[PDB]
């Protein structure tokens, strides 16, 4: 006869986990949380800032069991990393909710490991949607909540009353490292995109529309005679970009992405910046007082991602990324005094295998390294020649 | 099928606003919140400590729109100031609830702008009623709540589940400027009195009963043989005061104001200190074990208010206040080295107009100043002579 | 038509009280809360760390009334002390709930006196059960909650929606003495045992099973081939102990106490460490993969409790404790330079009376001292002789 979050939590808690990390860049220990996304494969989502530069990562279930997990993907821009429990047995995954349907008045419960105390559940409400600005270079469209969140909670779950995952708790405005009623979480629709990508490739292939923009405030809207105090203001479209071909002109106000109204430029960025190259979307435009509807196809890009350090753990040097279909890892740009280039690693190389194993993309490459060989025999291709780079 | 504050908030949020201030006393910027009290006129309530000494104040709605607002009233003792949006178009006002019916177990949601992040809503419960003591010189009868409140929230709303305003969030007990679960808000019945007054005059005309008092604790109650551990203890009544005429004698315990029980002396003070001169009230007395009922009529006073600085913004000098009916602003007491007296401002003067505009009270006077003339031509009356004081 | 904790709180708040203490060890003042356990006798429970080393303790009801209270019991290991209001008139006691039925999703409201502001009520949920580790020497099986708790709250109540007491708020993880969303409370079943004991004897007579243990983590469980990631691991049983006689062998995993599953060793300890000598319990064992059920009878012990300082307030010296049935207070072990031994207090003595009053146990002894004589005439027995120790 007493209302309680107990029943829903009895089913959902096994899905959340605590993560222990051991790394070096100097030795360090870190701790946070993670959410089991796929029970069978043992995929566990979490903040990239928790497992970053980790030599060893161990996952601990709510029932006590400890497992070892290895990395599979990690996107610093959105701060979402995907690890995988080695030897997954009898896990429970969380079902994901559609974050686009969240409304500010909604209830929320957060689950995670504050200060290593163990699985802690605290509750509150959605205080705001679309918050961004914490770190202006990243993609951020944070859900804001007043459910208590402290250090240890990162990577943990943020669920609705029905037990569905709506976000991953990431950060907190807070002077003197102590929760104050203001916490942030990446919405779940982003986790579902960034994550599935990582599963199938090892990195996120970022697509761009090709427009330069800025937040459309009330002042700029007067100067530009537009009845709208919020939205994405198009500064200029790039030549031969998706937006160009679609018909978007500078001085345009983007007001909606796929039926959904667009809080601001930051969200629009985070939205498409989370979609995979080739996705078909439709933008809601506003040029010279008239409404407009256009169809776009996200295209390639020049996304700065996966550095030779995120896959080698310590091997400073050229950045790397997938190449076309599963054609292998490509070495983006080699620096100079960076250790990677100090082993024959030159920009333009295409790692097509390692230790007699084929490397179609970053995921597979990280698989060979997962076994931890004593000597890594890279089979790359420079121009029209096949060569071999050795390591230890 | 999920309970949520969303529906109520969809209607109420447009009513709350964020306030940006620019001032000097040295230049400064400040930010807080405000609540739209009257949609048509654009009246917006807020903490006096937010807009105080402000050269410029800008209001921003939840939809993005920005407007400029000018001051109309401000009472430092209760910490309630009333500003007005210039050119109000399509606003939503909040409906006010009767704060006297609040009970400690009640739910509350607070809306405001913590650290400029934007419209943030957080929730909790009424933790206590009648808190006072924060600043012993002011009038305080605070509602206490554990809904998260931080810097930026001042001037914001505190509403019940039905969306009705029960208070204005004002302050927070909190070491290291971070919410800790203890926040305070001026109840709404006070805002409704102090505010309506300001609208119609520019200041609050304070009425007094004319009694000296003190909190009636358990100890004093023994010494005085009174069965009551709480209430207002009458130390002495002033000669020719309302209380005197009504029949109140020293050694009396005031236990109720208009049917309503009286938490303490502080509340009693804050209660009547918020009512306008001439209001008809009835006090519940307790003299020598016997219950008593008396009828009073709040009378004049010697209220220290509106200084020549709150209307001139920087012109130190004599204090000012309305005079009788709309008879104009009266200059209370001129200091000495104060800039105001340094322009011919002498105590006893009665500003009856400014720049060829009639000044019936402080509101109108602040209207002429609102246009921001280059030279302010005061038409005051010293004794039986009409004179003119110039400014720039 | 609005849901509210008000109705339940109207009945329950009178039960909680604020406590003011004056002590010395140097003079000090302290403040906290307490819960009325028995209306008739005026028994009030509270944290031992609040009233410890107190020369004077005053209790203040929610209605204003102040009373003086004297101590009756106090257990530092569990941090529960029992005081008694002198001259109890018209009090309300709280009814206790069965804490073993609490589940993590459950709602909770906390009542107490943060920073002396007065009776404050804040709410939240059960974040976790069985937390321990705060102070590794004590008995701890804390309920964890995110209802706001700050200094002043210790000794206060933690109740469920029905108004029943489920715990006593004791401490908070919190950098910079400010609530952060993590608070702890001793569950009510412990308060009900530790407390009733104190009532009937002045101290808690601690019983032990006689086993050496440790938390059974996942690692130790592999090494020991046991399908269980949590429980109490038996390191060794003591000779002629209850556990010995019952049949418990080292290398055993205790997994349940009286039907109830056992979170960990810490809980198991806190559980039985709270039961009185002679209690009949049954343990759930797990030896060599096979389940086991055994019946035990808590036995004596060597519990380090009640020091000559907790009953004399300042008289350093030999520790003391009850003796057999109501046979009087026994002086455990006298130090050397300790003031107590500096008045003829030698270990082995059996205080059998004081100032012509019989002393059956520590409660009665503290009764004679309660009247505050000028000279305390102890009638103790050394060997086969009756002697008298004088004090002032």
Report DSSP state, residue A114: G
Query: How many CB atoms lie under 10 A from the CB of residue B386?
Result: 10
| Pair type for strands A385-390 and C232-237 | unpaired
In this complex, do A176 and B179 lie within 8 Å of one another by their Cβ atoms?
Answer: no
Q: How many CB pairs under 8 A join A and B?
A: 91
- Given a contact cutoff of 8 angstroms between Cβ atoms, the answer to whether A36 and A17 are in contact is yes
What end-to-end distance do the CA atoms of chain C give, in Å?
64
Beta bridge partners of A386: A381
A115, A122, A152: best mutation site toward chain C, by most C Cβ within 10 Å? A122
Beta bridge partners of A47: A80
In this complex, do A181 and B8 lie within 8 Å of one another by their Cβ atoms?
Answer: no
In this complex, do B115 and A176 lie within 8 Å of one another by their Cβ atoms?
Answer: no
Place of tokens 């709404």: B188
Distance of alpha carbon C47 from alpha carbon A304, whole angstroms = 57
Structure tokens at A121: 């559940």
Which residues in chain A are contacts of B178 at CB distance < 8 A?
174-176, 178, 180
Query: How many CB atoms lie under 10 A from the CB of residue B239?
Result: 7
Place of tokens 């020991």: C224
Distance of alpha carbon C96 from alpha carbon B256, whole angstroms = 36
- Among B105, B175, B180, the residue with its CB nearest the CB of C5 is B105
Distance of alpha carbon A230 from alpha carbon C262, whole angstroms = 56
Q: Which domains does chain C have, with CATH numbers?
A: 12-94 (2.40.10.10), 95-206 (2.40.10.10), 207-300 (2.30.42.10), 301-392 (2.30.42.10)
CA A263 from centroid of its chain's CA atoms: 20
Beta bridge partners of B181: none
**Cα dihedral C258, C260, C263, C267 in deg (nearest 10):** -40
In this complex, do A174 and B177 lie within 8 Å of one another by their Cβ atoms?
Answer: no
Three-state SS string across C336-355, please?
A: CCCCCHHHCCCCCCEECEEC
Length of chain B: 392
Which residues in chain C are contacts of B161 at CB distance < 8 A?
2-3
What was the elucidation method? X-ray
Structure tokens at C268: 């198991």
Compute the C-alpha angle A273/A278/A279, nearest 5°: 65
Instruction: Give the residue among C159, C160, C118 at the shortest CA–CA distance from C36.
Output: C159
C283 φ, ψ (degrees, to nearest 5): -100, 145
* Backbone angle region of B165, left / alpha / beta, with phi > 0 → left and psi within -120 to 50 → alpha: beta
Neighbours of chain C (3+ CB pairs under 8 A): A, B
What end-to-end distance do the CA atoms of chain A give, in Å?
64
Distance of alpha carbon C264 from alpha carbon C221, whole angstroms = 13
- Given a contact cutoff of 8 angstroms between Cβ atoms, the answer to whether C9 and C109 are in contact is yes
Say whether B70 sits in a helix, a strand or coil.
strand
Within an 8 Å CB–CB cutoff, is residue A332 touching chain B? no
- Among A8, A9, A176, the residue with its CB nearest the CB of C176 is A176
Neighbours of chain B (3+ CB pairs under 8 A): A, C
In a 13 Å sphere around the CA of A182, the CA atoms on its Cβ side amount to 24
Structure tokens at B39: 């949609």
Beta bridge partners of C351: C329
Q: Which stretches does DSSP call E strand in C148-297?
A: 157-159, 165-172, 183-187, 211-215, 232-237, 252-257, 260-261, 280-287, 290-297
User: What CA–CA distances, in Å, run from A347 to A206, A316, A317, A378, C149?
Assistant: 21, 13, 10, 14, 58
Distance of alpha carbon B231 from alpha carbon B228, whole angstroms = 7
Place of tokens 């505009």: B357
B49 φ, ψ (degrees, to nearest 5): -70, -5
- Given a contact cutoff of 8 angstroms between Cβ atoms, the answer to whether A174 and A182 are in contact is yes
Give C183: exposed, middle or buried? Use CB within 10 Å, 0-12, 13-18, 19+: buried
Say whether A135 sits in a helix, a strand or coil.
coil
Structure tokens at B178: 């971070």
Distance of alpha carbon B149 from alpha carbon B147, whole angstroms = 6
Instruction: Give the residue among A364, A290, A356, A284 at the shortest CA–CA distance from A320.
Output: A364
Give A313: exposed, middle or buried? Use CB within 10 Å, 0-12, 13-18, 19+: middle
Please name the residue ranges forming H helices in chain C: 6-12, 48-51, 188-199, 218-223, 242-246, 265-272, 308-312, 362-370
Within an 8 Å CB–CB cutoff, is residue B162 touching chain C? yes
User: What CA–CA distances, in Å, run from C212 to C252, C256, C284?
Assistant: 11, 16, 16
In this complex, do C150 and B180 lie within 8 Å of one another by their Cβ atoms?
Answer: yes
Place of tokens 């550095």: A307
- Among A4, A147, A178, the residue with its CB nearest the CB of C103 is A4
Q: Based on DSSP, count helices (H) and strands (E) in chain B, helices before strands.
A: 8, 23
- Among B7, B60, B121, the residue with its CB nearest the CB of A125 is B121
Instruction: Give the residue among B283, B5, B284, B50 at the shortest CA–CA distance from B154.
Output: B50
Say whether A69 sits in a helix, a strand or coil.
strand
In this complex, do A180 and B179 lie within 8 Å of one another by their Cβ atoms?
Answer: yes
Please name the residue ranges forming H helices in chain A: 6-12, 48-51, 188-199, 218-223, 242-246, 265-272, 308-312, 362-370
Q: Which residues contact B169 (CB under 8 A, 6 or more apart)?
A: B33, B110, B112, B149, B153, B154, B155, B156, B157, B158, B183, B184, B185
In a 13 Å sphere around the CA of C326, the CA atoms on its Cβ side amount to 10
In this complex, do C182 and A149 lie within 8 Å of one another by their Cβ atoms?
Answer: no
Q: After which residues is chain A broken (C to N over 2.5 A)?
A: 25
Distance of alpha carbon B286 from alpha carbon B234, whole angstroms = 10
Report DSSP state, residue A373: -
Q: State whether the Cα torsion A100-A101-A104-A106 is positive or negative.
A: negative
Length of chain C: 392
User: What CA–CA distances, in Å, run from A23 to A52, A55, A346, B14?
Assistant: 8, 5, 27, 49
Within an 8 Å CB–CB cutoff, is residue B115 touching chain A? yes
Structure tokens at B308: 């020549």
Structure tokens at B160: 């019940």
Q: After which residues is chain C broken (C to N over 2.5 A)?
A: 25
Beta bridge partners of B34: B17
- Among B124, B162, B181, the residue with its CB nearest the CB of C2 is B162
Which residues in chain A are contacts of B12 at CB distance < 8 A?
none
How much of chain A is helix, strand and coil, in % rounded to 5? Answer: 15, 40, 45
Distance of alpha carbon C6 from alpha carbon A300, whole angstroms = 60
Distance of alpha carbon A361 from alpha carbon C297, whole angstroms = 65
Which residues in chain A are contacts of C229 at CB distance < 8 A?
63-66
Specify the DSSP element, H or E, that contains B344. Answer: none
Within an 8 Å CB–CB cutoff, is residue C182 touching chain A? yes
- Given a contact cutoff of 8 angstroms between Cβ atoms, the answer to whether C331 and C324 are in contact is no
Q: Which residues contact B289 (CB under 8 A, 6 or more apart)?
A: B225, B226, B227
CA C167 from centroid of its chain's CA atoms: 12
- Given a contact cutoff of 8 angstroms between Cβ atoms, the answer to whether B39 and B92 are in contact is yes
Beta bridge partners of A70: A84
How much of chain C is helix, strand and coil, in % rounded to 5? Answer: 15, 40, 45
- Among A64, A66, A178, the residue with its CB nearest the CB of C176 is A178
Q: After which residues is chain B broken (C to N over 2.5 A)?
A: 25
């Amino acid at each position: 006869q007493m209302p309680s979050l107990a029943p829903m939590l009895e089913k959902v808690m096994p899905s959340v986990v605590s993560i222990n990390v051991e790394g070096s860049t100097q030795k360090f220990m870190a701790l946070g949380s993670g959410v089991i996304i796929d029970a069978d494969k043992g995929y566990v989502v979490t903040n990239n800032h928790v497992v970053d530069n980790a030599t060893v990562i161990k996952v601990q279930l709510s029932d006590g069991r400890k497992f070892d997990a290895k990395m599979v993907g990690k996107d610093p821009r959105s701060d979402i990393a995907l690890i995988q429990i080695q030897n997954p047995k009898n896990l429970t995954a969380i079902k994901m909710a559609d974050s686009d349907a969240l409304r500010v008045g909604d209830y929320t419960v957060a689950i995670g490991n504050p200060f290593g105390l163990g699985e802690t559940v605290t509750s509150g409400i959605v205080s705001a949607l679309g918050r961004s600005g914490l770190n202006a270079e990243n993609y951020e469209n944070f859900i804001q909540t007043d459910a208590a969140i402290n250090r240890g909670n990162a990577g943990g779950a943020l669920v609705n009353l029905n037990g569905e995952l709506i976000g991953i708790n990431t950060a907190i405005l807070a002077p003197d490292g102590g929760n104050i009623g203001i916490g942030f979480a990446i919405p779940s629709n982003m986790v579902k995109n960034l994550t599935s990508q990582m599963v199938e490739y090892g990195q996120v292939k970022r697509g761009e529309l090709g427009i330069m923009g800025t937040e459309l405030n009330s002042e700029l809207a007067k100067a530009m005679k537009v009845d709208a105090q919020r939205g994405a203001f198009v500064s200029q479209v790039l030549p031969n970009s998706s937006a160009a071909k679609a018909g978007i002109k500078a001085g345009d106000v983007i007001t909606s992405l796929n039926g959904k109204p667009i809080s601001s430029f930051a969200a629009l960025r985070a939205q498409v910046g989370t979609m995979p190259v080739g996705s078909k979307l439709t933008l809601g435009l506003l040029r010279d007082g008239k409404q407009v509807n256009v169809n776009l196809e996200l295209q390639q890009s020049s996304q700065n991602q996966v550095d030779s350090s995120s896959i080698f753990n310590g091997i400073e040097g050229a950045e790397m990324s997938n190449k076309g279909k599963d054609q292998g890892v490509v070495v983006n740009n080699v620096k100079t005094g960076t250790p990677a280039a100090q082993i024959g690693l030159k920009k333009g190389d295409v790692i097509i295998g390692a230790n007699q194993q084929a490397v179609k993309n970053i995921a597979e490459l990280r698989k060979v390294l997962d076994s931890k060989p004593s000597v890594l025999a890279l089979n790359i291709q420079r121009g029209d020649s096949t060569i071999y780079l050795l390591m230890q």
